[PDB]
């Protein structure tokens, strides 16, 4: 694998005006899905990571707008990162936008992490938009390798022992932490139970316990449950992704969960900032936001 | 191992803000060309596809209630 040949060209579009395609040829774009699925089953289900670290939320194939966050927080090796799912789907350039991010996965293997999201599984983004960029662009074949390689994304993270990462939620069947770490890869993502709750649960403010879902899948869970969670499993904080929010960061229950979007101007149809978290090796979490102009 | 029982994390007062780059970040929505019809023959092309080539340890749901 020309690993550094593939990672210059997907780099060499930073001077170019946004929507410029990189075209990698498809035996680049399988290697890269084949070594880095065979990285992920390697390493935990469930990561445990130490800082410093920075953690970024959805990107939705919005490439120049990841270049800029690794501008923002040094490029790797510069800086570890964990990202929290949703790298495809709605955005112009989801194919740069998962290739970088796998290729930096399989050049720095210990230092670089990519949980899944619910964009990850085959019956999202079939619809919203990865499969039709892999077929005008390539061919479906590829999609379907994208698609073995997503089912062995690992699915949460602990950093520190203090911050639990996932992309969506908690769940009413999450008791022990043993659970996430016996589910086997490859898989999909059902439509319902723990690791469908994981990808997509939302935290809501005005919900007592556990709510229903307004997108029809999973639930909401309410302040309280958060802190019984927190406390039972000697955790601070939860980071999840998977909702846009004005400021790119937004606190939850008394800063005991916040919810990271990284996408700024997001499709061109919201006006809100993208924001990474980044946490200093004495747990020290500061939030660095790209904001539209 | 870095865990314990008391409270680590803190929040920095500072917040750092810098700017978006302004360019066209509208795209085509492919989902909103798909007709009823459409809709139906991806749902069963998808089950084909689960049913028969994605490779998986026929993963799923539990449930009790
Ligand atoms: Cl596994
Ligand atoms: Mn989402
Ligand atoms: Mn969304």
Redesign the pocket.
Known sequence: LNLDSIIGRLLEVQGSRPGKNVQLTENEIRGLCLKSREIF?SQP?LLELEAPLKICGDIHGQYYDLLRLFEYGGFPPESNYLFLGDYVDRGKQSLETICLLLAYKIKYPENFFLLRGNHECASINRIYGFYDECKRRYNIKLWKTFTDCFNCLPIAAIVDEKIFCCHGGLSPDLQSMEQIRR???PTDVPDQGLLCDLLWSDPDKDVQGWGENDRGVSFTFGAEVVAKFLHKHDLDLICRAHQVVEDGYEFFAKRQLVTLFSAPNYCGEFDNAGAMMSVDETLMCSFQILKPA | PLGSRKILIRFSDYVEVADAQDYDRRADKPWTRLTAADKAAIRKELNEFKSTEMEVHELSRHLTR
């Open positions: 089953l289900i589910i086997m890869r």
